[PDB]
Amino acid sequence: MKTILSNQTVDIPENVDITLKGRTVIVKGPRGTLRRDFNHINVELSLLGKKKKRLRVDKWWGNRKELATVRTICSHVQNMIKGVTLGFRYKMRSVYAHFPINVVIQENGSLVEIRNFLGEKYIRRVRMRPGVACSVSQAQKDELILEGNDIELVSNSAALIQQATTVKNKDIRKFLDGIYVSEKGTVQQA
Amino acid sequence: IIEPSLRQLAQKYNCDKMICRKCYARLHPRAVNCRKKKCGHTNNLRPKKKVK
Amino acid sequence: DRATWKSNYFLKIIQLLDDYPKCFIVGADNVGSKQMQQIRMSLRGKAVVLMGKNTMMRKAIRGHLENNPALEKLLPHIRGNVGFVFTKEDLTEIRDMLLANKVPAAARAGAIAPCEVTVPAQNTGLGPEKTSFFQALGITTKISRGTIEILSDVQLIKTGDKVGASEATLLNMLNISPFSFGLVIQQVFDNGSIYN
Amino acid sequence: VFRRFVEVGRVAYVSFGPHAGKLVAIVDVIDQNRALVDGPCTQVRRQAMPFKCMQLTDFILKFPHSAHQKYVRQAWQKADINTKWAATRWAKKIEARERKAKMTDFDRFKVMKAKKMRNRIIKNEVKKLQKAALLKASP
Amino acid sequence: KASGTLREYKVVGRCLPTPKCHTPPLYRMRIFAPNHVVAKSRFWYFVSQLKKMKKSSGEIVYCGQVFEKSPLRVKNFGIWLRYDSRSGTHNMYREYRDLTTAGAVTQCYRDMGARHRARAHSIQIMKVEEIAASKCRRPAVKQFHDSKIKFPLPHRVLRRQHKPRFTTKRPNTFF
RNA sequence: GCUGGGAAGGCCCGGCGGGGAAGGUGGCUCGGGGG
RNA sequence: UGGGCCACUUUUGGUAAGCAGAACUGGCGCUGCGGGAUGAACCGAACGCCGGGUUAAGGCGCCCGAUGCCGACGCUCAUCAGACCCCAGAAAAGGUGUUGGUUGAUAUAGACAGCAGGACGGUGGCCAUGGAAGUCGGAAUCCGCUAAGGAGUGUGUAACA
RNA sequence: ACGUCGCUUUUUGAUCCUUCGAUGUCGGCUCUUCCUAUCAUUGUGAAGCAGAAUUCACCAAGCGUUGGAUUGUUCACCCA
RNA sequence: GGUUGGCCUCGGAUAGCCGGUCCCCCG
Ligand SMILES: [K+]
Ligand SMILES: [K+]
Ligand SMILES: [K+]
Ligand SMILES: [K+]
Ligand SMILES: [K+]
Ligand SMILES: [K+]
Ligand SMILES: [K+]
Ligand SMILES: [Mg+2]
Ligand SMILES: [Mg+2]
Ligand SMILES: [Mg+2]
Ligand SMILES: [Mg+2]
Ligand SMILES: [Mg+2]
Ligand SMILES: [Mg+2]
Ligand SMILES: [Mg+2]
Ligand SMILES: [Mg+2]
Ligand SMILES: [Mg+2]
Ligand SMILES: [Mg+2]
Ligand SMILES: [Mg+2]
Ligand SMILES: [Mg+2]
Ligand SMILES: [Mg+2]
Ligand SMILES: [Mg+2]
Ligand SMILES: [Mg+2]
Ligand SMILES: [Mg+2]
Ligand SMILES: [Mg+2]
Ligand SMILES: [Mg+2]
Ligand SMILES: [Zn+2]
């Protein structure tokens, strides 16, 4: 069955404006600019209000598979609004049983040094994605704070760190050591 | 000597998971069907066995 | 059975609200089953309390109300986990005893703490085999007279924070009063009147 | 993005089929592929018609769906589509394309003569404008 | 049975009069067939299943096409049918929108072939009925019950791909 | 030529009407906009 | 001439066989031609030497004659897709991929899914016992508060919790 | 387990279609290539995976898979 | 032995394109 119209609207806040160039959404909030294209999805994007700034996504004559993309675009756009207004902050805890994992943050938070993961002498060098800054928190002893505007980039940077500290040739249920994403949140808390 | 709350966090990514009985795929705890073609997306799943 | 159970409930509420012209609406916090029996015993000698699905309450007092007026004021007021208590006594004698018969419920895991409780420095008195819980939470203790003794006060918990799974068990073994809270009244209804 | 929509009262131009070159009004829609179609002032009686042969215009009539032909004709005649259609660039390109096809051998000769003179006068003036604009002496 | 654009036929038959019952009862059926020859053949197929009749023991007294009584009106058709799958026989209820009853039945024969690989000889139409818009059960049919229905034609594919076969301009799809 | 002596359909605002409704017009109510 | 063989269907032995043995009709042998790429037996059709017209079976992206139809309606994405009698490869069993259908059920007296509270007393119910308290087992399956609690669905504990 | 569905042609049968105016008939030696139903090695998932060791499974045939005693042996068995 | 006028050029999108013009920024 092909459904005539599947549509869904996201509400743009006042401090952020959205500009459309075809299926290319440019989000210009107070924390920067986020730009991402959706030319791989055949949808219609429209800015509705001059007062409340509504963005509506429409799919005409869609099958089940391509109705699933309507809310995917809306969720991606809402993350752009969230990123440019509040930012994205991922907190990572470095858990270990015996050898403490020493983390050194190199230039501008773009390189992460893992020294003593499970006591081995190999040095792990993980590069942050562009626009993502890593830092060592001052609140808890073993935290890493990943801050950025794009949830795609911040979360993938966090996954790079987590997958770098992977135990091999041992029982992962017993050797739980590593750096894991503790919570996912924002900056500015609003 | 891992303090318990961080022990739970590590177990979230290492232990609290489902295993496909046909292709041993490591799945999220709420999985009902395996995500992999090579077993045919079977619903023959079992919990990952604990060290307890 | 659901139709009969719902119909039985409608007959019960409508006959009870016609019988009792004075009632309080009361909110239900995290009140355990042992407490509802406690209040139900302490109340049934002279009054009755009714609790259940809020929609059953709105529907009963919307279709079978037309016999009497002044009852529609409850319709915009029965919201959330709230119910009625029906009484024939005065307001003061029922409110004060309702507030008096509080039950000191223990702190469950994953429950918020609106109150702040701090353990003092005193001889706990339990056996010298429970130091693991004190060591896990970070309380330094030494054995005195074959018992565990707290050398200084430590700030166990704050207002409005999460109770740890291994933190609530130290409350239970120490037998102190945690944050506790009962069947608190929302507002009253006296023959078509709203007060505090 | 979309500006022209299939809807009740939407006037469509028939591109091919037995009714090619006609204007019709969409009265009702069926099964996504076809529509109830009626052109009372363009000699197309009510009938089903695939959406593939339609090309939507910018004219929308106001009548309820599945209304009788009389009401469609009244809506078509009031604010008449026939004169409005003939005034559009779309229609006069259709008409121009038609008269060029029916042009005879004598007309082809006279067009060849007129085009020859017109192009020489225009292309003269282009050279003059080029030569004039070539006088740019400034820092 | 093959197909094409099916037509509705009103076929009336009866047994031959025998010196047991002088006036045997008359029976009527609605047959959707490409032509009256097939319609008469399918009539004997059905009355033989229901009653104890044969073409040789009976006769057909009438076989005329049933013209659609409102071919200018859009209506929803509910069709009850039984078909034999590769592994059994199933009863189906299906809905279609069309201007004619025979057009709706023709849609059903194509749809059963497309979705269930059912050939016409396996399909057995047992009830065709014009249903009200509020009695429809299929969402594909129901979504067209909108007095303000409005939809664009999104990605118009060029169909004259060989006239011209070679060109300078790439085709437009937004119209 | 035949057919349901075709079925529909067009015009006569079809006229005296009756009934039914809904893919519900106007109006009214509620919720969002342009001076 | 008295070696036959093949195909539809019927049919005996055999696990089966491009095996062995019968019945019936047709065929190959003795037969070319169109189609099945190719092929004794399949499908069409049987043949003097030619011109024109039309077909059969089979086809009409290109090889390669013919769709270079503004063909109709759907279904399907395959990191071994599929693609035409004989025929030249596949089963049981699975899929929360998608499509259609059957039956049943819940729901404004508010379903479903999520987030958040309650989830009790007799009773740590009886007989098993070393502890089996709801959860190692054999039987029973009740009462009250009830909105609701099973004298218990699973985790867990030696038993508890 | 009781049952039941397959695959393979490295076993052995079954058949007798090709070869009886002849296709040199076992084993070993030598040498190349191919298959994967993977013994090892690379990368992984699972465990009754603490480590060590081992077992099951996936992508996977790139690379390697040996020296000897007895036997014509193929096989077999033992030594290292 | 063929042949029987030429086309001298945006990039491309397709749920979109093409053309023109005033301010801003690039010498
Ligand atoms: K003879
Ligand atoms: K003889
Ligand atoms: K063999
Ligand atoms: K042989
Ligand atoms: K020989
Ligand atoms: K040898
Ligand atoms: K040897
Ligand atoms: Mg979400
Ligand atoms: Mg190991
Ligand atoms: Mg002989
Ligand atoms: Mg013989
Ligand atoms: Mg034989
Ligand atoms: Mg033989
Ligand atoms: Mg011979
Ligand atoms: Mg012969
Ligand atoms: Mg022949
Ligand atoms: Mg041939
Ligand atoms: Mg072939
Ligand atoms: Mg000829
Ligand atoms: Mg061919
Ligand atoms: Mg050709
Ligand atoms: Mg020879
Ligand atoms: Mg020789
Ligand atoms: Mg030789
Ligand atoms: Mg393999
Ligand atoms: Zn699997």
mmCIF file of C-alpha atoms (C1' of nucleotides) and ligand atoms in Angstrom, chain G residues 36-39 85-88, ligand 18:
data_model
loop_
_atom_site.group_PDB
_atom_site.id
_atom_site.type_symbol
_atom_site.label_atom_id
_atom_site.label_comp_id
_atom_site.label_asym_id
_atom_site.label_seq_id
_atom_site.Cartn_x
_atom_site.Cartn_y
_atom_site.Cartn_z
ATOM 1 C "C1'" G G 36 13.539 -25.275 -27.595
ATOM 2 C "C1'" A G 37 21.247 -21.376 -27.792
ATOM 3 C "C1'" U G 38 23.064 -26.342 -28.424
ATOM 4 C "C1'" G G 39 20.336 -31.979 -28.773
ATOM 5 C "C1'" C G 85 7.255 -27.797 -21.519
ATOM 6 C "C1'" C G 86 10.840 -31.992 -21.919
ATOM 7 C "C1'" C G 87 15.478 -29.416 -19.214
ATOM 8 C "C1'" A G 88 19.485 -29.957 -17.392
HETATM 9 MG MG MG J 18 17.958 -24.740 -23.448
#
